[PDB]
Each structure stands twice: as C-alpha cells, then as structure tokens.
Amino acid sequence: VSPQQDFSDLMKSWKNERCSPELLPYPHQLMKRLLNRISMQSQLIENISMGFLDMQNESKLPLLCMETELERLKFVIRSYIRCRLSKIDKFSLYLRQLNEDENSLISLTDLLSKDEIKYHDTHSLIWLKLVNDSILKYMPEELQAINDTEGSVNMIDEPDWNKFVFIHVNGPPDGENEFGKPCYTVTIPDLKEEVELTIGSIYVMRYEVIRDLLRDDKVAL
Amino acid sequence: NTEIIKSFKNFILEFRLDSQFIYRDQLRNNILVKNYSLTVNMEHLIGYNEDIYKKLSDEPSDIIPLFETAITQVAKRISINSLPTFQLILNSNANQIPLRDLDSEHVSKIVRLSGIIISTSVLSSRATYLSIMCRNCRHTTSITINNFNTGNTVSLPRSCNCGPDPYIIIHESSKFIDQQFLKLQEIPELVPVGEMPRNLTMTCDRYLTNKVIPGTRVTIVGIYSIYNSKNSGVAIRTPYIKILGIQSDVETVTMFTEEEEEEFLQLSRNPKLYEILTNSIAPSIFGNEDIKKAIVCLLMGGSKKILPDGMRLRGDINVLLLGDPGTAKSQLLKFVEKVSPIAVYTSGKGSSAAGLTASVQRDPMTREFYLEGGAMVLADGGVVCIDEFDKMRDEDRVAIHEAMEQQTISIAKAGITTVLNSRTSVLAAANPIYGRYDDLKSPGDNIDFQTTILSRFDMIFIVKDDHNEERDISIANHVINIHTGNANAMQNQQEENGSEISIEKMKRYITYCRLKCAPRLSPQAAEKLSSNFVTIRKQLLINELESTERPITIRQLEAIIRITESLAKLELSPIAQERHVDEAIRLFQASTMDAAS
Amino acid sequence: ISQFSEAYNKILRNSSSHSSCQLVIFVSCLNIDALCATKMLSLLFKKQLVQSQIVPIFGYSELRRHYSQLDDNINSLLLVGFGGVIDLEAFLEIDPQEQSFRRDIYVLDAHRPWNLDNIFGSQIIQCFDDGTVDDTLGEQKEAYYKLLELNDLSKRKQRKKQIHEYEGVLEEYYSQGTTVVNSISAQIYSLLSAIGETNLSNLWLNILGTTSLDIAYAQVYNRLYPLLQDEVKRLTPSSRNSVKTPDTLTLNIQPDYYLFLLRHSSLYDSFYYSNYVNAKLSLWNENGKKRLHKMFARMGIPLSTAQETWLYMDHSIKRELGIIFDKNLDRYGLQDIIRDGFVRTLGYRGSISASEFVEALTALLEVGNSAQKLTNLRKRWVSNFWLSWDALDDRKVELLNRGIQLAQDLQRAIFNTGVAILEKKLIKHLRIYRLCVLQDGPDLDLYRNPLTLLRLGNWLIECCAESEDKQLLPMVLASIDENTDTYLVAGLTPRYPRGTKKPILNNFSMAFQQITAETDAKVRIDNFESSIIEIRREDLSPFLEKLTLSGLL
Amino acid sequence: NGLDLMSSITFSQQDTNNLSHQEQEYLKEYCDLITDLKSGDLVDIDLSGSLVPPSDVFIDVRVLKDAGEIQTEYGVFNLIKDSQFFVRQSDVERLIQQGYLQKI
Amino acid sequence: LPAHLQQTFSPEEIQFIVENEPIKIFPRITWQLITTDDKALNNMVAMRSTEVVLWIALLLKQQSKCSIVAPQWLTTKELDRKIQYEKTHPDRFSELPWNWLVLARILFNKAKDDFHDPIHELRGKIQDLREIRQIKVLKGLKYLNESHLQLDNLSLLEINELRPFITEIMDKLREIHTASL
Ligand SMILES: Nc1ncnc2c1ncn2[C@@H]1O[C@H](COP(=O)(O)OP(=O)(O)OP(=O)(O)O)[C@@H](O)[C@H]1O
C-alpha cells in the first residue's frame, strides 16, 4: 500500500479504458484511498510555503518539485472521469435496459459512483424533453417509448463486441498453474483453432475471447 | 568518376538543416507513390563544397549521369528486381537574360530563361536499355544510352570472316523515354526597338512532360547544347535547349495544398464578397458599378447539363458592350486578360475570319494535310476578347454563328470532318454609327441590318455621355492621382492590406471555386421568374403599337437563370435563395428599359 | 558606488519567490543597441529561474501612464537608457517612505551628460556607478557640496560668490551636447564575465550593439576592436576545422566591406550604393553611370550563375578583388572599403556576417505592419517592434530573409527623393546651417517614423561630405504627412572624413530648451530623443529667426 | 463551460439565437447541470478544460487584442497592452482557453 | 467530452507514460523531496549512480546543477550489432529497448551538451532504424490473416500509428466473414 504502488495501478487502470469498447467497474475503493491524499499534500505545501515567506524579515528547489507533481497526478484523474462521461452518454439506453429488469448485473457502487448516475438520469430526462415537445407532437401510438421493437435494431445497444485491441501479455511468472510449453497461456475462439499467446508477444484479438482474462490483471493493454 | 560518385552517395543521405534530415525523408516519400524523381534545389546544395559545384557548372553531361547513378544506388538501398532509373530536376533563380546570349560563352552552360510556350507536338520514343544480337555467332550484349552530347552518342560496335555491322535492334527486352519538340516563344515585351521575335526548340523527359498548355508564362532552366541535322554554306549547326525543371507559375488537374483554400474558406465565411470585388477588381476605374458587376459573373460561369437525352443546355453567358469613345470600353479589356486563367487577345479586324476557327496546309513531311491552328481551339474554359463589330463586313457573321450557341464546330475541308469540343465564352466592344447622332435620331441603326447577331448575345450595356458638372471634377481629380505622383501604389497598399484583394490572388482564387462546387438554383424560386417574365413581354408589346420595330426573345430568359447561377458559384452555396435572385434581376432590369430608349 | 557583482546578488534576494513578486523592466525600442542588451539579460534570468515582465515604452510623455498608475508590490523596476539628463524624480515624485527604502530601481543610461542628483542622492536611484567614469565630473567635490548646507555680509557675499563660482561650473555643465560614450553592450557583458558564463551566443549577441554605432561615431568601437580580438581567441572552440558538423556555430574573421548586404544579395546592386561611395567621393547622379563602368565592371557582369558568383565563383573573382583592392588603392584613393570585419556561420545554410545583419534589423523595425489618429499610430511601432526581438534565434529563420528583401528596395525608395531634393537645389546656406524644407514631393508617407529620418540625413550628410574647409555644420530638415502640421523636425551631427580631434556633440538641445520656453504655442518634446522635436507650420518660420541670432556653438 | 462571463451567451450566433435560444433551456440545463458537477466532486478537480498534458513550469507568453485589469486571484498580473510574460505554467490555462493570452 | 481524439492517443501524452520511468544521473549538489514518490536523500555525493525518475531530472538540468549519464546502448559502436541480426532475418526484429524513439528526442533537446560526440554520428544511426522497422511493417500487414497477427518488438510510437486504421480495416471485413452465415 505504498504510494508508488498506489499510483502505478491507477495508470494501468486508466490506459486500459482509453480503447475499451464497453464499460468497466469503476474502482472507487482505491480512489478514496487517494482522494484524501490530494487534499493533504496541497495542505502540506499550503503552510510550508508560508514559513518561507516569514523567513525574509535561499532554496528554490523543494517548492517547485512539489507544486508541479501533484497537479500532474491531478491531471490524470481529470481525463479519467471525463471519458466516463464520454462513454456513459451513448450507452444510456442500453444500460437502463440492463437496469430496468432484474438481471445478472446492477448499476452498483463499484460500477458507478454518486454523481454520474445523478448526471445520467437527469440528462436522459432532458434529452427526452427535447424530442417530445418539439418533434414528437405528431407521434402516433406505436412509437412512444424510444426502443426498438423490430425492423431497424439500432435504438438498443452498442454491440461492438469484437472490436480489435492490441494486447500486451504481462503474466506474473510463478511457475503455479503451468500448462503450455514456454509459459502458461490459454485461448479459445468461437470457431477457429486455439493457437495462443506465449509470454509478452503483442497480439490482436476480439473482445469476449479476452474479457475473461481481464478480471484478473495478468495481461495488459 | 568513381571517386566523384563516392562523394555523392556519402552526401545525399546525411545532408540536413537542424534536425529535419530532409533528403532521406522525401526520397522514401517518393518511392512509395511512383514518381522516381528528385528536386535538388542547387542553391541549397552549396553547403558542402564550392569545388563539387564547380566540377558541375563548368562541365556537362558527365555530371548529370554520375549523379543519376548515385541516386539510383541510394534508392536501391532504401528497399530491402523492378527498379527503373531516376531523373533529376534542378532549379535556381539567378536572373533571366531573355534571348540575347546566343553564342559567346553560353554554350553548354547552366542558364535560366522566361518565355511563352505556344506549340506542342505529339509524343515519340527513344530507347534507354537495349539487348543486341549478332548475325554470325548469336552474341548477346546490353548497352544503356542515358545522356546526350538526339542519338548517335555511341553506335553499335563491330566485335563479337566476320562481316561488319552484324548487329540488330530486337524488341523484346527494352525500355523507352519520350521527347516533346515543343517550341518556346519569347515573352513579347522585352526586346524593344522595332523587331519581330524569334524562337527556339526544346525536348524533355517523361516524368516532367505534359505539364504545360499553350498560353502561359513559364520560367525554365537548362542546357544550351548543340545538335547537327543534315535535313547552307559553311559547316554550321543549330541551337536547342535541353530542359531540366519547369518550376513555373500556376497552371492558369486541380491538385494543390490545403492552406490555399483555408484563407479562401475564411474569406467566404465573411458575407461581404460581392460588394468588395467591385472595388477590388479594377483599382484604376472610376466607378462604373453596373458594368463591373457583369465582369465577375462572366469569368466564373454557370454549369453544363448533359441531361438524360441527347441534347444539352449551353451553360454560359456572353456580354456585349457598345458606346462612345473615351468611356473605358477598350482599356478595360486588357484588364480581363491577365486575370483570366486562359485568355486570348485577338482584338482587331477579325483577322481573316476563316482563320479564326481552324486552318489546314500542305505539310512538308509526306506532303499531307492536317489541322494545326485556330483562335478557338486554345481558349476552352477561358474567354476571348475582340472588338470592332462594324467594319468587319466580310465574314465575321458567318464564322461565329456555329461557333456560338452550340460550341460544336466541324471542319468540312479536304481531310477530317470531326466535331471537336469547345466550351468558349466570347466578349466584344464595338462602335455605333459615330455614337452621338445615333442616340438623337430614330433609335435603331446600331447594327445596320441584322438583329440575328444580337439575339445570340444576351447581356448588353449602353453607356452614354452626360454633362454632370459635379462628379466629373472628381474624375479630373482621379486621373491626376494615378498618372503621376503614383500615390495609389501607396494608397492601395494602405487600404488593401486588410480590406481589398490584390490582382494576383484572384487568379489563384477563381480556378479553385469554379472546379469544386456544382450548384443548382432553388426549386421554389421558380415562381419568381415566371411571374416576372409575363409583364416584360407585355412591356414589350406596349411599344410595337407605336409603329416601332427593331430585340427581346426567349433566349435572354434562359440567360437570367444562368445569371442567378453565377453568384451561387461565388458564394459556393449548393442551393440558391431569394436575396440571391432579386439582386440578379436588379442587374438585368437596368438593361431591360435600354430597348425603350 | 555599485560594484558590478554586488547588484546582481542584491537584486536576487529582493524578488526570487515563486509567487507574484514580479520585477519589471522597461526598454526604448527605437535604438537597436537598446534592444540587444536586454535580450541577453532575460535569458540568464531564465537560468536564474525567476519570473519577469517585459514592457516596451517609446514615448517620453508616455512614461507616466505606464508606471505611475499601475503598481501593487513591484519592488524592482529597471530601465535601459532613460534618465541621463532629465531628472525622473522631479518628473515622478516619490516621497520618503519606510535610508533602506522599500522600492528600488536601477538605471542603465549610456550618455555622457549625467545628473549628479541621481548618483549622489541615492535614496532610491541606485544607478550603475562602477568603473564607468572614475573622474565623474571632478568639480563636483566642492561645487554643490557647499550648496547642500549653503558683519558676515562681507563674508557670506564672498561665500555666495564662491557659490556663484560654483554656479558657473554647474552652468557650464548641463550645457553640453550628448552622445553615447560606451554602448550598453560593454557593461553587462563585462558583468557576466565576472560571473563567468561561457556561451558563444552571448559572444554573438554583444558584438551587435557596438556594431550599431558604426554610423554615429568613429572610434569607440575602434577602442573595442582590440577588446573583441582577445575574446574570439580566449573563447576558441577548436584548433582544427573539424568539418561536416552541422552544428557548433563557428567564428572566424574575414575582411569585409562597406558594400553591404553583399553575401546575401547581388554584387550587381552595389550599382546603387557605389555612387553613395562616389557620394563619398564627389558625385551622385551626373556622371556616375558614365564613370562607374570600368572599376565595378570587370565583366558586363554575367547572370548565368551569378547567384554563385557572389556566393561561390567569387573564390577567384573576389580574390581578384583581393588583388584589385590594392591596385584600386591608388585608382581613386577610395579606402573606406577595406575593413577588418567579422563573421558568423551556421554549419550550413551559407555565411552571414554582422555588418549586413544590423541592416536587416533596422529596416524590419520599420515595415511589417481632434488628434485622435495618433493613438492608432503610436501603437503601431510598438507592435512591429515585437516581430524583431524574436529574430535572434534559430527558432525562426524564414522571416530573416524578409528583411533582406525589404532592405534593398527601401534604400532604392529613400534614394528616389534624395536625388530629387538634391537636383531641386533647395538647400539654402543661410549663415551657419543649411535649411531644407521637404514640403511635398512624392512618397511622403514613409517619414512618420523617425528611424528612417536619421538614415535619410545619413545619406544627406554625405552629399555635403566634400572638402568644405569652412562651414562644417549639419542641417535641419522638415516634412509633413498628416494633420495639424506635426513636422517632426530634427538635427544632425557634422562628420569628419577620417583624418575625433574636436569631439563635437550638439549645439541644438541647448537652444531647444529656449524655444520650448519662449513661444509656447504648440511646441512639443513628447518624442523621446532630444534630437527630434515637433513644430507648427506658422511657428517653424520664426523658429529659425530666434536661431539665426542665438549663436550657441 | 465557465471561465469568464459564463452566463453571457451573447456576442455569439445571435442570428441563430432563434435556433439556440429556443433550445437554451437544454443549453441552460447542461450549463446548470455542469455547475453542480464542478462541485459534486468532494475535492475540487478542474473540469473546465486543460486537456493537453503539461510539459514544464516556464513558458514564454505574449499578449495582444486585450486591455483592462483582470486576474484578481493568484496575484494580479497587471495585464497591459503588448507585454511579454514569463511565468509559471499553472496560472494561464484559464486565460488561453479564454483567448486573451495568445502565443506559447 | 473531447470528441476529437478518443479512440487513440495524441503524440503529446505517449511521452507522458515514459517520462515516469527512472534512469541514472551524476549528481552534484548537497526535506527537499516529499513528493510521495520521492526517494529524497541527504547531502548527495557526486560520482555515484542513482536511479532517479526522468522528469525531475529534466527540470534539474534547467537550473543546471547536475549531469546525465547515457544509458548502456547509446553509442554508435553498440547499435552496429543490432543492424546485422535484422539484415540476415527478414522474419522479425530481434532486440529493442522498447521506448527508444521517444527517448532520443528528449535526449537531444537540451540534452545535447552532455555526451561525447552525439552530433553528426548518432542521428545517422537512428533514422536508419526509424525506417528499417517500418520497411518490415509494410511486408507485415499484407500477410493479414483472420484475427491473428504477430508483433514482437514494436515501439510505443509505431503502435500508436498502425492503430487507428488497422482496427476498422479488419473489423469491416469481420462482418462479411461472420455475417455471411
Ligand atoms: N471610368 C474611368 N475611370 C478611370 N479612368 C478612365 C475611365 N475611363 C477612361 N479612363 C482613362 O482613359 C485613359 C486612356 O483611355 P483610352 O485612350 O484607351 O480611352 P478610349 O479607348 O478612347 O475609350 P473607349 O474605350 O471608350 O474608346 C486610361 O488611362 C484610363 O485611365
């Protein structure tokens, strides 16, 4: 739980999102371990600069390195929460359909935090109040709810579920569970032969052939 | 030499300015798309060594081939066989002695010129890689002929009892280059005492040919070597120019960069173009607002519909002026010549009207006929300009009737009978029967007999000579400003640099905005012109009851629909509007009542 | 009183925090030597890691409405060449506030007539008083030192007569002309050597400012032609050539000439300003094209490879000039051409020397763009100033050539009326000076900015640079372009034909105080340099009438 | 999304301020719905731009087309005409997107 | 909500993940570093290697009170063995420091006056490798099978440049293979 360890995991859990086709569970638990830290070190350099003001009725290094560092770490989470908004916007009709009827997944705390589901329900409301009174005044009585029955099925989902993404294999060498000849890797397609990864060779694949192996971070992006 | 070569493969892979490393970074970028060419830019070359330049600028032919072989080897290296040889393109800008140095020291020396190319020829073939067989022993060699002293650089040898010239030229493993024999004419302003100009001859290579149409200014760099043809007294020879790089001005086939239209898109977003061009076109013309609007729509044009049957609609306009002398009907016409992409100035006498369209002659090789000349074959897309439509009494009328309204001529002479294409646009300015008394008599007698030429034109201005005793003193104030003191060179650089458009930017501008957007008028706007026209014929026939005859027919009505298409090419909107179309009739309704007066 | 190493550490601690503890400098833009001194001071502050604020200022009446209204906690103001003569403390009052004051300025004036209140009376005015002048007006040690403290009416009257004796020695002082004795390149570069920062870019920068004064004096840079010869040898980067390196920015010395912009342009073009060298001999328009066609015409110059017969083929032809210019020694005696010269290179891209390089900076400062129109004109010169300061690094290249092509036509433009006024024959020798009033010829618009006018006089002082064994007085010109008769009139200096035995500075600024006090009907000193003032049309004709009688040389 | 005079949606597309003003209730809704999202984070992280990553601390910045006194916070910079600045990086992001300081 | 560069990375932040890896320095100077990823020291002894993160060391060279040491493969006498294992092997490229191209560009801007002869020698031995890598990639993608490629030693720069087309140019052909049946 060292702060170097408590940061390199964050960077790995930011880059993986930035080419993802679909959402991932928002790891709120590690964020709160550092949401206090960004307040504290700002407060640490808050008063410790003021002692340098009151010494002048020398050192210029140790102030400058502190000031640029924590805002640079602040820059990472600035992008990291905007791309959630950049992803939750389009997916709205799908995720409510995952959230309307009871099913295998709920929009949980480890899935989404407080403010974005406060954002989502309000923004999807005001979106519906643009199409209604300005456009759907002459909407007849089969086109009320905006979701596909049949015909053109595009008011439903983002089924981009075999978009290709470059993969870097970073399995922790402990043998442990060893199956293959060079190292322990597995694959299974839907149709083709099970030719697979070895250790760190960069490959290209679809998504549900790799969606299983990313719950356990043994292989990066 | 080999040593010299060792001094160029080791130079065109690490020459750079400060961390850009350019010459590897374009040679790779020219081997992907097939061009196989360099641009050395000799004034930028000098950073190595003045000696290696001076082994070039004092001696020829040897240097070009050694350099070419070095470049081919480097190109070959940037790969790992189908590898052709390359070609060079050199360019500098020292100064252009126009056509004056002829024999003194400028024989086989690097030189830079400026001219106007007028006459292209058909293509040809010379070889560059051969495979030669002997009769007696079936020997097999291969000889490459790259650079020239034309042919007869080296001939086929005698070596392999054995009879001489035992060798032949097969055609199974060969390559070929094309020459041009295009002819350069002097730019007709810089040899002035009293003399006619002269002409030279020049050939070139395939990967820099077919880059010129006749009617343009070009600058050109090359060699001044000498050939000798035995089809004149002393053993003489002839001059010609082997050329290297036509780094001329614009084409004047729509490939260019993106920043050229960036400002153009940044200007077209400002909706002030129409009112600002009337000032910015002609910076030395006192007003003349109604005529000035007509010239910018003539240069742009309309469209061309090949609608799904045989016929077509002639999508262009053709203005016509006439008026008193001293009222700018003539000096305005040289001004449209430079601003046009293609412009021809045959403005005098008609010039033997059968020779305006096409001409044949006995040709000295094979004693045959074909088609060579014409004043309308070279003026496609652009605009011609002529004058004096009174005292061409012989055959000007019979030579423009087929030339207009269909633009599909065909020569019925001794050889071919072919319908060659034309997309021309005419323009003229004439005189009435000495001007004043014509406008103080019965208002006919302008063209003495025929109205049939007037019905082919559509847009007609009539200027006059008032005696406004107020604005004329400003005109007398205007001419002394331009004529001496030359303060308009300093006034139109302190009002133009943020507001107006210079004279050469429009030549850049018009060729882009024509060749991109294909417009169409508004479909609900058709109620406007139909409601407009029905009273104009009533305004016509209210005059013929007064024993008055002549001219308005329906061809001008399908010209107004081209007029409203013209400013749509200016704004580059694919649809038209009604603020658009009401200003167009506002230009034509100031030339509807001209038939009454 | 201020040793050079002391004020650097003194100004260090007074503003070094990482907050808005800003120090600001002001700079006159109209002088070229004023610019280049400031540029090297900024970059050492970058590796001193301090915040800053750079504001130019051009108007001596505009100095009030930049400083004296927008100040919060600015403790360290800094000037370059502003208050050598006129006391700014009477101009801008500062009450004694907080002996160990709270707001501190320096000044970097470069002018010989100083003002003793600024150096003595240093409560806030901490001027650069180091070994600049060790003999700083040696009569000061009893003159005003008895003015500070000021039966006995036969003794005090003698003591007032001593004060009156001290009055005249302070009346002869503040009654001299001005110049710059030592350029501001000399001070700060010597200060940096006391700190010891070795970069040849500094050695490239500091020589430009002393090169700018090759037209307003003769021998101050002849005093420094030794003091660069050591530095190009002490800062020797290499003994070998060490070829093919595109970098390393090497320094050499080759003999260069007053036929300027030569290695950029065409040895042809000397065709204009070789007649300037014949205006430096005897003639400008009459016989020159009949005269010039032997010496500068070793060929009717070939334009086949001419771009590299002033670049490359001159290996043999300018070395023939190397053997022409000792047999053109006697041919006309024309020996204002041989000069030692200095040069820089780049590694590639052709050499550029420093003689022509100051020529591009002056011309590029010009072009590159009731009484309410002046604000939109006074804001133009500050803006186009800014597109020249950036032109001293390799981060920009492709606008340095724009001044090159704007050099060799404006000189053709400035000549195009100089030949007119010379054959107009309107130079009237009245008694002492010569008066010329350019009422209106053509092309009047290029004379609003004053920096063209000193060059126009620099060509016009040379048409009268014949023998003239009597009456060696410079002229005063006149022109007008805009409303209410602005008339930026100016004076010049007389020039020696390189034979200073008598260093004539100026006689006009003494008389300029008189006419700005007597008439008082639209007379102005709002323009910065004292050699240039303004005058009204109905007052410029009685301007000279008070000048033709007041002999103040 | 709020840097200076945010509620001023004027001097911008007034001819299409029959288009957008008739949909301003959505625009205003997004506006107000982004204001609380600037404060719904329990720690103040900026969301008004700054998308390009930082490089260093010290950046040469010029200014033009501007006047008046601005920047009441983080020290007043005394913004006067055509003046060079050479400052810390982290104070200029709320003015570059404002378009008052011009060049990096 | 960028909506401008979302599928990929701009080249202004691929350098941002490599600057947060450490290298060795030569310190000069004598709490001072409480950056939460710091390794502050006491009075620091010169002539001693220490693995320090790069971005503060770039800032440390601005004030100019230190000096960098080059990494172990940054001489021209060392890359010569790299350019022969590839010229005999058109199969793949063997041995790469995996972040090389973005490393030298930082190491030439303001890090030029440190090492013995980088200029006029090293950039010749770099730009050759900038293309011999990418000559190999043009033979590679013509061999595109279905959903299986083999890239072994690719930089972070080239993988940010093959990316934005190679995804959808095989995804679009993934339709006609799959949705055929
Ligand atoms: N409207 C005008 N504005 C400015 N200049 C004009 C105008 N009309 C004529 N001029 C001037 O007249 C001068 C000479 O014209 P020119 O002698 O060619 O007239 P012209 O040919 O007799 O007139 P027209 O073309 O009517 O016969 C030109 O320099 C031109 O500037």
Curated annotation (Swiss-Prot), chain A:
- Main location class: nucleus
Q: Which UniProt keywords apply?
A: DNA replication, Nucleus
Effect ascribed to mutating K87E: In sld5-2; temperature-sensitive mutant. Defective in DNA replication
Mutation effect (W14R): In sld5-12; temperature-sensitive mutant. Defective in DNA replication
Tell whether Calcium is among the UniProt keywords.
no
Q: What is the effect of changing S13P?
A: Defective in DNA replication
Where, per UniProt, does this protein localize?
Nucleus
Sorted alphabetically, the Gene Ontology BP terms of this entry are: DNA-templated DNA replication; double-strand break repair via break-induced replication
Give the UniProt entry's GO cellular component terms. Answer: CMG complex; DNA replication preinitiation complex; GINS complex; nuclear replication fork; nucleus
- The transmembrane segments are none
Q: Which residues form the signal peptide?
A: none
Asked if the Swiss-Prot or TrEMBL record annotates the protein with the keyword Nucleus, the reply is yes
- Which superkingdom heads the taxonomic lineage of this protein's source? Eukaryota
The record's function comment reads: Required for DNA replication. Functions as part of the GINS complex which plays an essential role in the initiation of DNA replication by binding to DNA replication origins and facilitating the assembly of the DNA replication machinery.
Give the protein family. Answer: Belongs to the GINS4/SLD5 family.
Q: How does it assemble?
A: Component of the GINS complex which is a heterotetramer composed of SLD5, PSF1, PSF2 and PSF3. Interacts with PSF2.
Name of the featured protein: DNA replication complex GINS protein SLD5
The organism of origin for this protein: Saccharomyces cerevisiae (strain ATCC 204508 / S288c)
What fragment of the full-length protein is this?
Answer: 54 to 293 of 294
Curated annotation (Swiss-Prot), chain B:
Please tell me where this protein is predominantly located.
nucleus
Q: Which cell locations does it reside in? A: Nucleus
Tell me, how does this one assemble?
Answer: Component of the MCM2-7 complex. The complex forms a toroidal hexameric ring with the proposed subunit order MCM2-MCM6-MCM4-MCM7-MCM3-MCM5; loaded onto DNA, forms a head-head double hexamer. Interacts with CSM1.
Protein's organism: Saccharomyces cerevisiae (strain ATCC 204508 / S288c) (Baker's yeast)
One GO cellular component, as annotated: nucleoplasm
Report the sequence similarity comment from the record: Belongs to the MCM family.
Q: What is its EC number?
A: 3.6.4.12
- Which CDD domains is this protein grouped with? MCM5
Q: Name one GO molecular function term.
A: DNA replication origin binding
Give each disulfide bond as a residue pair: none
Residue ranges annotated as motif Arginine finger: 455-458
Which keywords fit this entry according to its UniProt record? ATP-binding, Cell cycle, DNA replication, DNA-binding, Helicase, Hydrolase, Nucleotide-binding, Nucleus
**Listed Gene3D superfamilies:** 2.20.28.10, mini-chromosome maintenance (MCM) complex, chain A, domain 1, Nucleic acid-binding proteins, P-loop containing nucleotide triphosphate hydrolases
What domain of life? Eukaryota
> Which InterPro entries does this chain map to?
MCM, MCM5, MCM5_C, MCM_CS, MCM_dom, MCM_lid, MCM_N, MCM_OB
User: What lineage does the source organism belong to?
Assistant: Eukaryota, Fungi, Dikarya, Ascomycota, Saccharomycotina
Role noted for this protein: Acts as a component of the MCM2-7 complex (MCM complex) which is the putative replicative helicase essential for 'once per cell cycle' DNA replication initiation and elongation in eukaryotic cells. The active ATPase sites in the MCM2-7 ring are formed through the interaction surfaces of two neighboring subunits such that a critical structure of a conserved arginine finger motif is provided in trans relative to the ATP-binding site of the Walker A box of the adjacent subunit.
Q: Which residues form the signal peptide?
A: none
Curated annotation (Swiss-Prot), chain D:
- The domain of life for this entry's organism is Eukaryota
Q: Which residues cross the membrane?
A: none
Protein's cellular compartments = Nucleus
One cellular component (GO) term of this entry = GINS complex
GO process annotations (BP)? DNA strand elongation involved in mitotic DNA replication; DNA-templated DNA replication; double-strand break repair via break-induced replication
User: Keyword annotations for this protein?
Assistant: Cell cycle, DNA replication, Nucleus
Described by its record, this protein's role is as follows: Required for DNA replication. Functions as part of the GINS complex which plays an essential role in the initiation of DNA replication by binding to DNA replication origins and facilitating the assembly of the DNA replication machinery. Required for the chromatin binding of CDC45.
UniProt similarity note: Belongs to the GINS1/PSF1 family.
Other remarks on this protein: Present with 1431 molecules/cell in log phase SD medium.
Q: Spell out the subunit comment.
A: Component of the GINS complex which is a heterotetramer of SLD5, PSF1, PSF2 and PSF3. Interacts with PSF2.
| Entry protein name | DNA replication complex GINS protein PSF1
Q: Which organism is it from?
A: Saccharomyces cerevisiae (strain ATCC 204508 / S288c) (Baker's yeast)
Q: Where is the organism placed in the taxonomic lineage, from the top?
A: Eukaryota, Fungi, Dikarya, Ascomycota, Saccharomycotina
UniProtKB/Swiss-Prot annotation, chain E:
Q: Cross-referenced CDD domains, in alphabetical order?
A: GINS_A_psf2, GINS_B_Psf2
Pfam entry (one):
PSF2_N
Q: Does the keyword Nucleus apply?
A: yes
Question: Where does the UniProt entry say this protein principally localizes?
Answer: nucleus
User: Could you name the Gene Ontology cellular component terms for this entry?
Assistant: CMG complex; DNA replication preinitiation complex; GINS complex; nuclear replication fork; nucleus
InterPro entries, alphabetized: GINS_A (IPR021151), GINS_bundle-like_dom_sf (IPR036224), GINS_Psf2 (IPR007257), PSF2_N (IPR056784)
Signal sequence region: none
Keywords in alphabetical order: DNA replication, Nucleus
* Gene3D superfamilies attached to this UniProt entry: 1.20.58.1020, 3.40.5.50
Subcellular location as annotated: Nucleus
Tell me a GO biological process for this protein: double-strand break repair via break-induced replication
* Its job: Functions as part of the GINS complex which plays an essential role in the initiation of DNA replication by binding to DNA replication origins and facilitating the assembly of the DNA replication machinery.
| Subunit details | Component of the GINS complex which is a heterotetramer of SLD5, PSF1, PSF2 and PSF3. Interacts with PSF1 and SLD5.
Identify its protein family: Belongs to the GINS2/PSF2 family.
Would you tell me the protein name for this molecule? DNA replication complex GINS protein PSF2
Species of the source? Saccharomyces cerevisiae (strain ATCC 204508 / S288c)
Source lineage: Eukaryota, Fungi, Dikarya, Ascomycota, Saccharomycotina
